[PDB]
Amino acid sequence: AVGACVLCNSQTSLRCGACIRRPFLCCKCCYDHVISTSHKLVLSVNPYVCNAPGCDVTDVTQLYLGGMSYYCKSHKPPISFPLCANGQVFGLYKVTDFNAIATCDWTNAGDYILANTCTERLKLFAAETLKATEETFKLSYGIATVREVLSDRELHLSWEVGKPRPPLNRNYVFTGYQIGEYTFEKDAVVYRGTTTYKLNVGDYFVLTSHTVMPLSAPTLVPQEHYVRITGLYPTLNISDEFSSNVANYQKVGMQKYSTLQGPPGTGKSHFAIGLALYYPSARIVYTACSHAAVDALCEKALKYLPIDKCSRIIPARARVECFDKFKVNSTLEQYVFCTVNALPETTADIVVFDEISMATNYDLSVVNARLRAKHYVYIGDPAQLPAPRTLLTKGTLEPEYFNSVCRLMKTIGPDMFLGTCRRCPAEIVDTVSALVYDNKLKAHKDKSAQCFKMFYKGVITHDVSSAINRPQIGVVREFLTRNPAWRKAVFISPYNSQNAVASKILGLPTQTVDSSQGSEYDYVIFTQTTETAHSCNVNRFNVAITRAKVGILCIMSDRDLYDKLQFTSLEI
Numbered sequence: 001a002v003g004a005c006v007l008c009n010s011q012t013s014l015r016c017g018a019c020i021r022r023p024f025l026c027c028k029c030c031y032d033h034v035i036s037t038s039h040k041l042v043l044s045v046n047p048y049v050c051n052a053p054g055c056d057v058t059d060v061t062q063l064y065l066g067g068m069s070y071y072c073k074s075h076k077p078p079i080s081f082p083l084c085a086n087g088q089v090f091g092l093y094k095v096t097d098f099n100a101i102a103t104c105d106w107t108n109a110g111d112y113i114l115a116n117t118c119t120e121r122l123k124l125f126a127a128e129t130l131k132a133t134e135e136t137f138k139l140s141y142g143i144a145t146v147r148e149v150l151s152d153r154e155l156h157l158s159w160e161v162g163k164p165r166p167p168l169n170r171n172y173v174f175t176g177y178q179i180g181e182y183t184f185e186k187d188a189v190v191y192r193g194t195t196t197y198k199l200n201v202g203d204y205f206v207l208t209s210h211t212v213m214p215l216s217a218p219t220l221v222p223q224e225h226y227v228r229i230t231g232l233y234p235t236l237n238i239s240d241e242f243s244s245n246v247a248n249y250q251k252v253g254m255q256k257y258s259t260l261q262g263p264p265g266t267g268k269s270h271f272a273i274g275l276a277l278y279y280p281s282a283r284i285v286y287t288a289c290s291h292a293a294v295d296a297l298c299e300k301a302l303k304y305l306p307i308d309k310c311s312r313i314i315p316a317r318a319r320v321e322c323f324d325k326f327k328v329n330s331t332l333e334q335y336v337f338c339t340v341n342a343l344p345e346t347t348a349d350i351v352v353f354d355e356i357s358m359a360t361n362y363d364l365s366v367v368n369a370r371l372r373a374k375h376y377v378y379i380g381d382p383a384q385l386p387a388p389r390t391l392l393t394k395g396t397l398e399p400e401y402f403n404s405v406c407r408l409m410k411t412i413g414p415d416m417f418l419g420t421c422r423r424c425p426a427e428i429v430d431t432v433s434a435l436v437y438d439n440k441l442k443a444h445k446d447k448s449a450q451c452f453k454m455f456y457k458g459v460i461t462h463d464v465s466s467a468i469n470r471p472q473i474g475v476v477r478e479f480l481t482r483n484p485a486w487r488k489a490v491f492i493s494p495y496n497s498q499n500a501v502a503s504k505i506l507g508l509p510t511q512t513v514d515s516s517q518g519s520e521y522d523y524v525i526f527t528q529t530t531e532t533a534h535s536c537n538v539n540r541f542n543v544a545i546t547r548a549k550v551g552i553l554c555i556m557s558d559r560d561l562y563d564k565l566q567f568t569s570l571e572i
């Protein structure tokens with residue numbers, strides 16, 4: 001009932017009753033809120049409402065204090081002070097940007113821009129408000145009731161009329177009735193049940209609207225520089241493998257937090273797990289937003305770190321299969337590998353946060369509020385894909401606005417930059433180096449002479465809003481008959497529905513760009529599918545073509561990105 005003002009920390013009894021989060025506002029800051037917004041309900045121990053029976057005046061600007069009681073202009077006694085006077089709202093202990101965060105619906109890019117250019121307290125208010133807004137939107141979607149069960153991987157769905165039907169991909173996980181979480185792909189629909197329950201007729205599926213806890217810890221703790229390595233103990237016997245990262249590993253020990261920008265295949269995994277071998281006594285908690293990123297870090301630890309001193313932290317709600325080779329849920333092991341949402345409350349010599357472009361400011365705050373650590377290391381790449389913003393429909397979110405780390409990396413530069421790509425044929429390294437890395441990314445590999453492009457707009461059909469280009473898949477089919485080395489290729493495209501079609505016609509394994517991130521395949525076939533903003537996004541384009549170790553075929557729709565591709569062009 002009494003806390004600190006989210007804009008200046010000044011003590012107060014005043015909360016805004018109109019803000020979805022109900023932030024504490026001091027008398028000065030609460031005034032400049034209610035005088036500039038549709039927000040006029042103020043809360044104290046008792047709410048600021050006229051006390052006259054049956055009176056419905058709740059607007060703080062139309063109210064007064066009558067002794068220790070509140071009344072409107074129509075009910076106030078002769079001796080009454082206005083609640084809104086000389087730049088203040090009356091409360092105990094007696095912002096433009098706060099107003100925009102408080103009142104925005106989060107459908108505009110400028111909203112996320114402001115959520116990342118504002119003060120640090122207003123970054124937490126923004127992340128709360130947004131995450132709340134994201135959840136109360138999941139209510140807006142219709143329920144899906146099973147009409148009939150066909151097979152162990154297909155059924156027919158009946159959708160609640162009046163309420164819209166959510167996009168039917170992987171980024172939308174339903175809660176089934178709790179028969180465990182479930183996902184669907186396209187009148188027969190393919191069902192993927194986290195728990196193998198023999199789907200019954202009438203059983204209904206609904207989207208998981210989780211309760212948005214409030215944020216306490218900053219996105220980033222304040223930066224500390226040291227004179228010498230602090231609370232860590234280096235080796236002077238350090239494997240030649242990791243000799244390239246010794247100067248970076250010493251920067252990590254001589255700062256509170258550090259930023260590593262690592263373009264595809266520049267040895268992020270290698271750097272993170274090498275940090276443990278360089279400070280071999282140090283307790284490290286390895287965290288990322290996804291189970292895939294954390295399981296990636298587990299595979300690298302398995303190779304180089306002692307398996308006994310490693311534990312994979314899995315929450316009791318088993319959502320996806322993940323890493324098996326460690327001891328599970330031993331929080332006290334020197335090496336702990338855990339998704340941000342499952343982190344325990346503990347401390348660490350070093351916390352390593354990986355896949356930092358996929359992290360929200362909400363994730364940056366949670367991490368700092370569960371883990372107290374001597375050193376924090378932020379590993380990722382602002383030139384890769386951000387967390388999907390399900391509410392954002394107007395404007396494109398630039399990398400400098402993904403989170404506070406990406407903002408740092410794009411403005412003051414990262415602390416450390418892995419600058420040599422060991423994965424990709426030079427054709428791919430040269431293209432993305434120019435596209436997103438201002439020509440600072442170097443090829444270790446030679447040109448493969450197995451990187452082809454083809455400009456072929458084909459024909460764009462849609463399943464709802466997800467795009468399909470059958471002619472582009474026809475061009476791929478033709479290529480495969482003449483290029484049998486590509487039989488093993490991973491088919492990639494920016495659209496599930498295109499991948500679904502390509503799966504049936506080609507029989508190739510299938511990946512969206514967004515699900516391909518952090519993976520690598522010998523051969524990649526990418527069809528752009530459309531000329532949309534989604535399919536032309538340079539971060540997405542970067543990830544798509546940097547999945548390939550040996551070869552890539554890009555069938556393109558965008559003249560620009562086709563011409564940028566430093567690949568051999570094909571005819572037809």
Ligand SMILES: [Zn+2]
Pocket residue numbers: 016017018019033039102
């Ligand atoms: Zn408000």
Ligand SMILES: [Zn+2]
Pocket residue numbers: 005006007008009010025026027028029030
């Ligand atoms: Zn204040």
Ligand SMILES: [Zn+2]
Pocket residue numbers: 050051052055056057071072073074075
């Ligand atoms: Zn009244």
